Amino acid sequence: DVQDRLSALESRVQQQEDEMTVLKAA
Amino acid sequence: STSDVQDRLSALESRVQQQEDEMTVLKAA
Amino acid sequence: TSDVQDRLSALESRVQQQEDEMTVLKAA
């Protein structure tokens, strides 16, 4: 329930975290 | 205290979406 | 349930750090 929500967030944050490293790279 | 988790949750999914949006705008700009 | 509390705080940390990284870039 909540945990579905937690886990969906660490996905979105990870991708945003990923896009940043890439953008800082690019 | 489940309301608090609920509240903390919803505030996080709000902040993250705004960042997600902030990101796409930059990638655009 | 602590894991739930722990997962929360680890997320609000990443997000603030993420927000901080952007404001730095919005400068450039």
UniProtKB/Swiss-Prot annotation, chain A:
It comes from the Eukaryota. Phosphorylated during mitosis. It is found in: Cytoplasm, Cytoskeleton; Cytoplasm; Cytoplasm, Cytoskeleton, Spindle; Cytoplasm, Cytoskeleton, Microtubule organizing center. Essential for the formation and stability of microtubules (MTs). Required for the organization of the mitotic spindle and for the proper attachment of kinetochores to MTs. Promotes the recruitment of NUDC to the mitotic spindle for mitotic progression. Homotrimer; self-association is mediated by the N-terminal coiled coil. Interacts (via WD repeats) with NUDC. Interacts with alpha- and beta-tubulin during mitosis. It is linked to A chromosomal aberration involving EML4 has been identified in a subset of patients with non-small-cell lung carcinoma. This aberration leads to the production of a fusion protein between the N-terminus of EML4 and the C-terminus of ALK. It is unclear whether the fusion protein is caused by a simple inversion within 2p (inv(2)(p21p23)) or whether the chromosome translocation involving 2p is more complex. Belongs to the WD repeat EMAP family. This is Echinoderm microtubule-associated protein-like 4. It comes from Homo sapiens.
UniProtKB/Swiss-Prot annotation, chain B:
It is found in: Cytoplasm, Cytoskeleton; Cytoplasm; Cytoplasm, Cytoskeleton, Spindle; Cytoplasm, Cytoskeleton, Microtubule organizing center. It comes from the Eukaryota. Disulfide bonds: none annotated. Phosphorylated during mitosis. The modification Phosphoserine is found at S1. It is linked to A chromosomal aberration involving EML4 has been identified in a subset of patients with non-small-cell lung carcinoma. This aberration leads to the production of a fusion protein between the N-terminus of EML4 and the C-terminus of ALK. It is unclear whether the fusion protein is caused by a simple inversion within 2p (inv(2)(p21p23)) or whether the chromosome translocation involving 2p is more complex. Homotrimer; self-association is mediated by the N-terminal coiled coil. Interacts (via WD repeats) with NUDC. Interacts with alpha- and beta-tubulin during mitosis. Essential for the formation and stability of microtubules (MTs). Required for the organization of the mitotic spindle and for the proper attachment of kinetochores to MTs. Promotes the recruitment of NUDC to the mitotic spindle for mitotic progression. Belongs to the WD repeat EMAP family. This is Echinoderm microtubule-associated protein-like 4. It comes from Homo sapiens (Human). The gene is EML4. The chain holds residues 16 to 44 of 981 of the full protein.
